[PDB]
Structures are given as structure tokens and as C-alpha cells.
Amino acid sequence: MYYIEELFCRLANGVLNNTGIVTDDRGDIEDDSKPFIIVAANEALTRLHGRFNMRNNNVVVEMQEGRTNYPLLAKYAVQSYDPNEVKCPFIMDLAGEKFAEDVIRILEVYDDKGRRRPLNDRNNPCSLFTPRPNVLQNNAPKAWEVLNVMYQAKHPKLSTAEDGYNEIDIPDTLDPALDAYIAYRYYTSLNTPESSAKAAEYLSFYDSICREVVEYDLTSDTEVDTNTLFRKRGWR
Amino acid sequence: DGKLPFVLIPYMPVKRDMYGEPDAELLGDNQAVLGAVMRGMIDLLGRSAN
């Protein structure tokens, strides 16, 4: 983990060392050009967390009577809901761990009693459904039913504001991939043909780094488990 | 009779010995090898997706 300022220094003394958006001392990016990097940086982090299952985070959802669709939005969180239009929040989080709507793909759902709940099983009456990728639907809200949703999560969105996040938590082996994508976005913005050729090199380099990580499995992406169907099938 | 009332009957007699050898003495290795093959066949079928 490191501050976004270190990212600015690394870009200043890295791929963007010969650009006009760096300071005279090569210590930081130009202040007016900082939001350009921030937008690209968030985009790059989203792609990395999609190809690689690096972060697995879980959330707690409380079933409310008379409600079937449960969007996973921060406006329904207890720490961020507005009482004027929301009767009561159903997403529970902590003051220092506010929900940031980092949901990418739902993996599994367990209720408060410890039973696995099938998802998108059309032939199963008790199964849950997801009409939208970030919306959870329950067709039978009970009295004290509480659901826990474990999902693949993206990195929290960076922001230059003081209250916003200002740290990066990614495997250090993917740092060249992050720099390459940011460099690709910058050089692609310039429409000069010379910059276009340079932009493609970084994008190709970024893809090469990603496949190298997959080839050696440096992020423990591959997962195996002991066989259980042998007992269930009754082979004995 | 004037001697012990016990009678000894060996299955496979041993040269100058009382206790004989049962058939389990010679089949110790064969049973273990056969068991390994049978378990391997079941594991191949059982663990396979079907």
C-alpha cells in the first residue's frame, strides 16, 4: 500500500518522464492535469480487478417487509442514507468501512442460519434472482431473514479530495501493468501519428504483463478443493 | 491313556514344528496388490464428472 502521491512520483519518474505535464523537478504531475490521471487510474484498476479475482469482499443485507428488490447502493447504507426519503436502511456497514458500491459480480449468498442460497436457479422456487448485476431480488422476505452476500469487489475509487480514498492496495507485481495502461491512455489522447505508435506499445506491454502473471499464477488465482461428489454420489 | 488329552492338527505342516501355516501366509502381498488396483478403478470412475 502507498499514497497516490507516490503514484504521481512514480509516473513522473517513469513512463511520463518526457512529458509536458510533469513539474520542472520531475517530482509531481501538474496540478491542473491531475484529474486526467485520476480518471485513467480508476479505469485501469477496474480492468485489473476484473481479469484477476484479487479482492473478495462481503456485505450484509437485512430483509425488509414489503420489499423484494434490494439495490446495492450507498444511499441504502446505514452510514449514508438520507432519512428524508428512506424510511430505514437495509445495508449494514461501519463508520470507518462505509459501503462504496464496489460490487462487480456476486459469488455466493448465505443466510443468517448458515444455509447456502442458490442464485439464478429458475426451476428452484426458493432460489434468489438478480435482474441487474448490482441488484439483489428476494421473492419471499421473512421476519428475521438476514442475508450475507460475498462478491468480487473492485478497488475503491480514488479521489484527490481529503475525505476520499488516497491509497492503492494492489499486488506490487502488477504495478508495471498499471503504469502501462495509464501511459496508453495518455499517448492515445494525443492525435499525432508518432504518439499513436508509442501508445500501442504500452497497451501491448500491458497485455503481456497480465498474461505473464496468469502463466505463473502469482496472484493465487487458481483454486482447488477436496472432492465431495464421491460421497454424495454414493460410490463409497 | 496316560498322556495329554490334547490333539494337534496342522493345516500345512512345518518341518519339525507343531504349528502349521494357513493359506494367509502366502497371499499377504497378492491381496494388498489386488486391493490397490480395485480402489484405483473406483477412484477413476467416482471422481470423474458424469
From Swiss-Prot, chain B:
It is found in: Virion. Forms the portal vertex of the capsid. This portal plays critical roles in head assembly, genome packaging, neck/tail attachment, and genome ejection. The portal protein multimerizes as a single ring-shaped homododecamer arranged around a central channel. Homododecamer. This is Probable portal protein. The gene is 59. The chain holds residues 358 to 407 of 763 of the full protein.
